[PDB]
Amino acid sequence: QLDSKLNDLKSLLKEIANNIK
Amino acid sequence: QLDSKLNDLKSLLKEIANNIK
Numbered sequence: 001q002l003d004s005k006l007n008d009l010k011s012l013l014k015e016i017a018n019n020i021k
Numbered sequence: 022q023l024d025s026k027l028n029d030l031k032s033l034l035k036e037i038a039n040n041i042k
Contacts, residue, residue: 002024009031016038 006024006027006031009035013034013038016042020041
């Protein structure tokens with residue numbers, strides 16, 4: 001479950017990367 | 022405890038993302 005939270009963080013950071021890019 | 026440190030890193034990266042965004 002903690003790792004799934006980390007993967008959600010990964011999705012969020014990818015989303016912000018796409019936004020800024 | 023290491024995972025909590027990783028989650029603190031997650032909070033920091035989210036904060037910088039909000040700052041730049």
